[PDB]
Amino acid sequence: SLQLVKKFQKRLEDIVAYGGTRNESSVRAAFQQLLSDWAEGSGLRLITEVTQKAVAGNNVRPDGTLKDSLQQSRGYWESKDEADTLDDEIQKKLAKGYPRDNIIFEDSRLAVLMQNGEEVQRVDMGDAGALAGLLKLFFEFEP
Amino acid sequence: SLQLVKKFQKRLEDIVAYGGTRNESSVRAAFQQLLSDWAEGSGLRLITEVTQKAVAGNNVRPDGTLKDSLQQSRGYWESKDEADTLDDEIQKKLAKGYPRDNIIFEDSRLAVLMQNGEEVQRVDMGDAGALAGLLKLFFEFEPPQVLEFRKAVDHFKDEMPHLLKILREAADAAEQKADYRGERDHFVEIAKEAINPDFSPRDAREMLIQHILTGDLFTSVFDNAQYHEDNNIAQQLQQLAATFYKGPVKRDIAERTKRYYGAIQAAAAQIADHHEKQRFLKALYENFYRAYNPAGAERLGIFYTPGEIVRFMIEATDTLLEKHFQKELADKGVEILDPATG
Amino acid sequence: SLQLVKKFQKRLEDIVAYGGTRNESSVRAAFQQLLSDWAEGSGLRLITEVTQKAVAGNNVRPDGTLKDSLQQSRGYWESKDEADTLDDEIQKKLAKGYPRDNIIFEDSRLAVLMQNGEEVQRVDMGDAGALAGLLKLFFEFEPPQVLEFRKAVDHFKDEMPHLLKILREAADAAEQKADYRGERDHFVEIAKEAINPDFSPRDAREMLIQHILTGDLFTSVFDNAQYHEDNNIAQQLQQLAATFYKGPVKRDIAERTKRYYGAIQAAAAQIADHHEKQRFLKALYENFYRAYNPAGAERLGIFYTPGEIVRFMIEATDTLLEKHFQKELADKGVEILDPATGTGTFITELIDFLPKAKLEQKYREELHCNELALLPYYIANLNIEATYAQKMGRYEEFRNIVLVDTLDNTLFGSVTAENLERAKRQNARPVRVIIGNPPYRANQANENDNNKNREYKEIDRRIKATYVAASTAQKTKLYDMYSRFLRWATDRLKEDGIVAFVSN
Amino acid sequence: SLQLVKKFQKRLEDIVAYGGTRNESSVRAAFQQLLSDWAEGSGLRLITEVTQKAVAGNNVRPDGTLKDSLQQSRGYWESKDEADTLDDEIQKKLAKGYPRDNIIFEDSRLAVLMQNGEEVQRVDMGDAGALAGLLKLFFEFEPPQV
DNA sequence: CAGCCCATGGACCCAGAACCACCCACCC
DNA sequence: GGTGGGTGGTTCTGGGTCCATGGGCTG
DNA sequence: CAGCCCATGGACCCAGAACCACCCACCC
DNA sequence: GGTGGGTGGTTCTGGGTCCATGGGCTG
Ligand SMILES: C[S@@+](CC[C@H](N)C(=O)[O-])C[C@H]1O[C@@H](n2cnc3c(N)ncnc32)[C@H](O)[C@@H]1O
Ligand SMILES: [Ca+2]
Ligand SMILES: [Ca+2]
Ligand SMILES: [Ca+2]
Ligand SMILES: [Ca+2]
């Protein structure tokens, strides 16, 4: 709901204070936890950096890989640094053969959801109620 | 908490089950969660992939870095793959310079705590209890900066008499100013009729020495610089300080006491927890009178209490209140007075 | 210096000639005195048999330790006997846990430095050159703590907007009061005759922010809280700040700004040389404007001048004072003004140049300073007084800095009656050197910027009668702030003077 | 002598201001320097810690041993930490088997010169003029043949 | 005098590129 | 067992624009 | 009542005492 | 080449007094 969403923000604010680093390498840990928990709470998981292979044969590596019990993939997460126009890095990722089924291209400020090939929604990750909406949609997108 | 480790035992298997991966980068998320969550409470936080530099100037990246509010590393975590024999791989990355302060080398089935270049324990990953013990040892390590604070607190006890001698000279130089002599009568008379009917100008000078001693320490090692301009009696003795704490006069006293303050000032800057400051507060409360007014320190019996004595007291008080009056200690209405605070 | 090295070699033979002793208890006394005399020059001191703890814990006892003013060790010394081989016993002593950060293993015949577990200089002793090299390197090693004060300086250089946002929010929410709103409109009036004839309510808000921000750093990073209680300018402004920075509000803002100020004050406490802490004074001076008001950073041209240029510009004026006139910087009558003082690097390096005898008279009434902005003024004053403490002895308020628009000081500096009369005594002085670094700004980015260098009526009038007059250039760019400062400097200079500026 | 004693003071406070210890081992560096410097101009030299023999013993070890240009001991100094009561450290010392031909018993703020079989005068080290007069005699004491 | 011509040099900053650390698939 | 390749971070280093705004002059 | 008699437990220091660390003079 | 005395720090640890001062007699 909204509680876990607020918890993610708290964690990220501690990363940029106890470490001072706003690099994704350290910031991603916050969203990793949020995504992994909403998942277990809705019958799933968030196995991390599982190498996927593209049609062109490129071993891509999303930061996440919502997988389910029979070991199949349902979603993929990819967080970019909070220091770049997001709609530019989305293109670069997809141009390597990145999955287009249900991918959360997320920077620390904005979270974009793509499904099939269209931007379903873009939310300020700060608004608790708004992200709570987008995150729920990603976890409910069934094939 | 075996509770928090209980969940690690499952998330490790779950992450290999709901997705058939075994590689380190995919299975290390479980231990990340465990460490970061336990830390949130202890006061620390785990910042992952910190590019801390090492001896010889090469740059290294532990899997996690337990940092505190002053961005001061207190412990490092590092995870290898289950296949990679932890023992052999430990020395491989120790050569690259990975810190030996408090590093947890952790494979999927075994973990090794290494405090001060020495393997403390090698808990297996299956037992929640053993793992919890290892993690508790890792979380309760006194960093170099608290052994250094502790050394300095001892010196401050030995430097106390000479620092107080300089404060006596400051109060005697004040006793030569007529502005101070007038301000003295107001305080002596006031404190007498308001605290104890036999107050003396020397007791007022001693109280001023406490005010200015605690004042400089409270504005640096405690950094509560506002305390002295919001507390009723702090502002009541602010006139007694200002009289001789002005421009050149203040400078002289401050610089004279700086050689004693400097030691505990630096020490309490690289510390963040109030519990460390509490030791210095107790030392100041006692040593001052022992090295200035032992006559007062018998009429006020200034001695500090054991922590275990008041911890056990607090447990007993709640259980007794909840067996005769059936009320909790936190039940709104139970007023608790502390006559002799100290 | 190599002189001290030769003195040690004369004491080494004296011990084995007068006493004829070859025992460690007596062949090391020479090196003890040598490091001791070098150390007193650097600012540290060698304290013998300091019982230290080892990696195992076993109490070890390096024969000496380079203790600081905060009793921290910058290095160690282990004198052994002339006879025993050093390289074997270096590896046996080290096993018990002896230090390895900066230890000089000596044996009255060979001195080795193992710095960071690394042999850097195995100078065989009895040397008329590289032994002095060894001791120089040892007494100039970088403590592991100075490289963290550097790391924390850069973080703050980049988490300054986030910290400034807190202070910005505070000043907006204070405008709800009628005590703030009333006193911030009297600040504007007093400052519409002193520094900026176009002082806006938003300029008064900027000054308030700087005052508070630097107040918290001056009492912690630099330990000098009494500066703000003595400085005339601070007092005129706390009248305006303790209208909102009070009790609860004061505490709230201070505790919200801690996750930024914390680390800097936890590495600035472990260094104890002001010259290293001056790197932050510079950083704050520039970064603040780039993270808050770049419009000010433009016309004022806020920038720091590298020390090499400054030191050259000081020794060169001294070597010209006897050439064409006849004096020496440390004489009597060499009144050295410096408009545009900024971080104060032009008067701090002068203090270090002047000898430690006549410095008193020069610091008191021959060194003068001039500033327009608040942050530079405060930083410069504090820097000069702290450099005086590091050089002469007891802190003595520098009473020759002012807040006036140099080009307009020809009722100027009326912010405080103190700075007004301070700039009146300055004006009355027969100034002889005009050193400094003027702004080189000239024109705005694009005309939608709205930022022209204030037309200095009095000063540009003589430019028009002198530089512009002769120049028949169709376009006239002689109204540059650098050329305006040059005009002011030539007119302050009476006779026998050396204007030294660095500009476009 | 007077300017020199007035600098032994500076380097005394310096041991405690920089090091932060009052243990004998570290506070002895100030008096060592003073004695050596004074002796240099006069001609002699304080060679520190020259193991000296004893009437009853295997060997003893003073901490100062003025040895002249011809390797002959003509004066000594035994330092003391502030903790010990100097007077009772004297009898403790001159019983084990310590010399009395010329020895300076100095604590840190008071000094005696037990010279050739008897104490001369006891001076405080805080007073420059006092310590000057006494050290002069430690250096102007010459054997009877001279 | 007032529009209307004619100058003339201007206090940085950010994209690549090299390269490095760490781990993963894939030749070995 | 190496190794090249994906992901991300950290230093260097190279390399360069339209347009503001006072004088000089027609008119 | 004042001026003698009768109780009756007391908010810590410290002198060795090991014991070690360094290191020089003597047995190996 | 060991190897104990010999100087110095260091941290334990075992062990133990005369005498204030209110009240109840008390002349
Ligand atoms: C380059 S900085 C000073 C340089 C200084 N040496 C340093 O290293 O920081 C220019 C400074 O001149 C000051 N200043 C003083 N009077 C000024 C004036 N009349 N016009 C422009 N700037 C002035 C500004 O406040 C600004 O901080
Ligand atoms: Ca990423
Ligand atoms: Ca790892
Ligand atoms: Ca040695
Ligand atoms: Ca001694």
Side-chain angles (χ1 to χ4, degrees), chain D residues 26-109:
Chain D
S26 295
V27 299
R28 74 174 64 166
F31 205 43
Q32 186 173 355
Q33 294 300 320
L34 178 67
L35 284 182
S36 295
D37 301 336
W38 198 317
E40 293 177 350
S42 312
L44 295 174
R45 222 119 297 171
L46 178 105
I47 316 292
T48 59
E49 313 236 27
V50 175
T51 63
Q52 186 201 345
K53 179 62 173 171
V55 183
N58 170 239
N59 192 31
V60 314
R61 185 190 335 162
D63 320 327
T65 316
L66 262 197
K67 227 135 188 38
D68 184 1
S69 295
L70 295 51
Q71 320 214 319
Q72 234 70 64
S73 295
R74 42 136 296 161
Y76 309 97
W77 143 70
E78 168 69 36
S79 209
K80 266 108 167 71
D81 36 276
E82 271 278 342
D84 58 76
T85 8
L86 176 126
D87 225 59
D88 279 24
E89 238 286 281
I90 291 182
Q91 253 196 292
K92 175 84 239 84
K93 268 329 163 131
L94 297 180
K96 292 151 16 148
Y98 263 56
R100 216 167 316 175
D101 58 271
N102 200 15
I103 177 137
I104 285 253
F105 282 119
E106 157 249 18
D107 203 280
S108 209
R109 293 182 183 174

Side-chain angles (χ1 to χ4, degrees), chain C residues 40 234 237 263 420 423 495:
Chain C
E40 293 164 63
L237 262 86
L420 181 92
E495 275 91 32

Side-chain angles (χ1 to χ4, degrees), chain A:
Chain A
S1 329
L2 259 84
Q3 70 285 0
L4 221 63
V5 163
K6 287 170 228 118
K7 276 161 220 146
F8 151 74
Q9 298 143 10
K10 297 161 199 140
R11 302 162 203 148
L12 177 63
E13 275 124 41
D14 312 320
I15 286 142
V16 305
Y18 277 65
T21 39
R22 322 215 157 209
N23 280 352
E24 20 175 316
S25 283
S26 47
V27 157
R28 274 179 57 216
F31 210 65
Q32 186 173 355
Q33 283 160 306
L34 164 68
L35 295 174
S36 98
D37 303 336
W38 189 305
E40 301 145 28
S42 60
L44 252 156
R45 215 93 226 141
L46 185 94
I47 294 169
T48 185
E49 285 264 303
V50 178
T51 81
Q52 203 238 25
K53 183 178 179 180
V55 175
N58 186 229
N59 241 316
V60 294
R61 254 137 70 169
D63 287 337
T65 299
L66 231 75
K67 268 196 173 197
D68 181 65
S69 64
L70 295 174
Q71 290 173 355
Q72 323 287 346
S73 45
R74 295 176 64 186
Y76 299 91
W77 162 54
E78 183 65 13
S79 174
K80 276 327 273 153
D81 184 1
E82 33 191 291
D84 212 287
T85 298
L86 184 58
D87 301 353
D88 288 359
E89 295 302 320
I90 291 175
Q91 222 194 161
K92 293 179 179 179
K93 281 313 171 158
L94 285 174
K96 305 156 163 93
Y98 255 71
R100 295 176 64 186
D101 179 48
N102 193 4
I103 186 167
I104 307 236
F105 283 119
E106 169 256 332
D107 61 356
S108 295
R109 293 182 183 174
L110 240 47
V112 164
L113 183 54
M114 183 176 282
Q115 253 158 24
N116 303 293
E118 293 177 350
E119 183 178 2
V120 204
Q121 219 179 333
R122 151 188 317 239
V123 281
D124 184 65
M125 309 197 50
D127 195 14
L131 183 62
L134 177 63
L135 295 174
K136 183 190 183 69
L137 256 194
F138 158 72
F139 283 101
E140 293 177 350
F141 174 64
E142 63 269 288

Side-chain angles (χ1 to χ4, degrees), chain C residues 222-276:
Chain C
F222 305 102
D223 303 85
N224 192 31
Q226 205 198 140
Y227 171 65
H228 278 259
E229 318 160 15
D230 296 342
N231 190 70
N232 24 311
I233 309 296
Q235 283 150 339
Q236 252 268 23
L237 262 86
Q238 206 96 49
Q239 295 218 22
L240 151 84
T243 59
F244 59 88
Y245 209 48
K246 183 178 179 180
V249 210
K250 180 159 174 337
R251 194 71 83 187
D252 297 333
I253 308 156
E255 92 217 0
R256 277 148 28 198
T257 56
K258 183 178 179 180
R259 41 144 303 166
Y260 305 108
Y261 282 159
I264 303 301
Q265 102 193 14
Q270 286 226 316
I271 63 120
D273 159 62
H274 195 249
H275 307 319
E276 165 84 18

Side-chain angles (χ1 to χ4, degrees), chain C residues 24 28 49 61-63 77-81 93 98 106:
Chain C
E24 202 270 316
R28 81 162 169 228
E49 296 267 288
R61 252 135 98 167
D63 301 342
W77 156 54
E78 180 60 31
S79 212
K80 310 210 211 249
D81 58 302
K93 236 75 165 289
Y98 254 74
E106 201 235 344

